C-alpha cells in the first residue's frame, strides 16, 4: 500500500502505521524506495530505534488527529524538505501517520504548495495517488494556508 | 481497472461500461474515488436510476462511435468541467464509453487542452494511462481542435 | 509492471530482456504501447531482424555498463528523440538495457533534461516509476551534464 508523490526535486513516500510485529516488512519496503529518513507525525506504536538501527533516520513530530500541525512543526518540516533534497539529490522522505489519509498527506501538501503549486492543485495531485486523502476540516486548513516560498 | 488522469485542479476517472449485475460494486468504487457526477458518452446498456439514487449524478451525452462530439456536447462538457472543480475542489468527474479508448479519452483530452496543454502533450499524457487511447481519426480531430476558453 | 515515462510530448518505455525466448509477446506489447523505434543499449540475444520484420525500427547503440555513453551516442540519441516525436505525435520510443536500472534510464534522463528539467527533477521523475534507477557514478554523471544550448 505504498503511496509515492514526486515534484520536482522532491519525492515523498506516504505510508501506513507499522508495529513491532510488522516493522520488518515495513523497513524492507522503505529501503527499497531509497528512504533515508522517515518523519512519524502520529502517536508511537513501535520502537523507532529499530529503524535508526538500519541506517534510516527518524524524526518524531506527532500532532493530534484532525487538528492542524503547530507552527513549529510546519516550520521544521519545511526546513527539512528544503535542505534534504538539495544536500541529498534523488533521496526520498517517508512521512507516515496511522491511516495515511490526513496528517501525513497534509505535510506533503504544504510541501507541494511551497514548491509553487496552488492548494487545489496539491490536493488533486495527492488524491491522484491516495483515493480519500483529506477530510473537510483539513481541506479548509489547506485552503486558508498562506505560503512564503 | 480504472484509469485516472489529473492536471491541474482537474481530476478525471475513465471507467468501463458497467452492467446491472455489477452496478452495486461499480457505485462503491466511484464513491471511493470521490466522483459526484458521471458522464455516459455511449449507447445505454445499464440503468442509471440506481446510480442517481446513491447520490451520484448522471449526464447522458452519447455521440457516434468514432465520429467527433458535436459543438453542443463539447460545450456542455467544458462547462461542467470548469464549474464542478470550482464548486467542489478535490472532486473527480467520471467519464465512460464502451471500450474507453475513444470517445471518453477524447473529452478528457479536450479538457486538458483548454487547461493549457498542447494536443501532443494531452495525447501522451493520456496514453501513459490508457495504452491505445486514440485512433487516426480521433488524433486528427484533436490536432485541428482550436482551444476556446 | 512495464516502466513507462511521459513528459511532455515525449514518451519512453524502458524494457528488460525479452523473457522465455518468446519475443512474440515482447513485440505484441511494444505495438500496443505504440512503439515505432527501439534503442538497444546493451548487447544480447534478441532477434533484431524478427523485430524489424514486425514493423519496429531498431537502433544498436551499445555502451559500457556503468560508464557514461559517448558523445556520439548522446548526440544521436538527442536528435532521434527530437525527430521521432515531432514526426509521429503520440508515438513511443523503447529503450532496452539488461537490468533497466542504469544505461536505459540515463538516456531517458538526458531527454527530460533537454526537455527543460533540471537533473534532480529528472532523477526523481524516473525513480517514481523505477525504484533503484541510478547508481553513484550515473548520478554524478547527470549532475555534471550540461545540455547543449
Swiss-Prot record, chains A, B, C:
Gene3D superfamilies attached to this UniProt entry: Protein tyrosine phosphatase superfamily
Disulphide-bridged cysteine pairs: 42-97
Induction notes from the record: Strongly down-regulated upon tetrodotoxin treatment.
Domain Tyrosine-protein phosphatase: 1-149
Localization of this protein: Cell membrane; Early endosome; Endoplasmic reticulum; Cytoplasm
Binding, substrate: 103
Tissue spec. comment: Expressed in bone marrow, lymph nodes, T lymphocytes, spleen, thymus and tonsil. Overexpressed in tumor cell lines.
Protein's membrane topology: Lipid-anchor
Pfam families xref list: Tc-R-P (PF22785)
GO biological process: positive regulation of cell migration
Active site: residue positions: 65 (proton donor), 97 (phosphocysteine intermediate)
Listed result of changing residue 64 to A: No effect on catalytic activity
Mutagenesis / variant outcome for changing residue 124 to A: Reduces trimerization
Main location: membrane
Catalytic activity: O-phospho-L-tyrosyl-[protein] + H2O = L-tyrosyl-[protein] + phosphate
Alphabetical UniProt keywords: Cell cycle, Cell membrane, Cytoplasm, Cytoskeleton, Developmental protein, Disulfide bond, Endoplasmic reticulum, Endosome, Hydrolase, Lipoprotein, Membrane, Methylation, Nucleus, Prenylation, Protein phosphatase
Lipoprotein in keyword set: yes
This enzyme's EC code(s): 3.1.3.48
Posttranslational mods: Farnesylated. Farnesylation is required for membrane targeting. Unfarnesylated forms are shifted into the nucleus.
Stretches for region Interaction with ATF5: 90-125
GO cellular component annotations of the record: cytoplasm; cytoplasmic side of plasma membrane; early endosome; endoplasmic reticulum; nucleus; spindle
Functional description taken from the UniProt entry: Protein tyrosine phosphatase which stimulates progression from G1 into S phase during mitosis. May play a role in the development and maintenance of differentiating epithelial tissues. Enhances cell proliferation, cell motility and invasive activity, and promotes cancer metastasis.
Oligomer and partners: Homotrimer. Interacts with ATF5. Interacts with tubulin.
Similarity comment: Belongs to the protein-tyrosine phosphatase family.
Name of the protein this chain belongs to: Protein tyrosine phosphatase type IVA 1
Species per Swiss-Prot/TrEMBL record: Homo sapiens (Human)
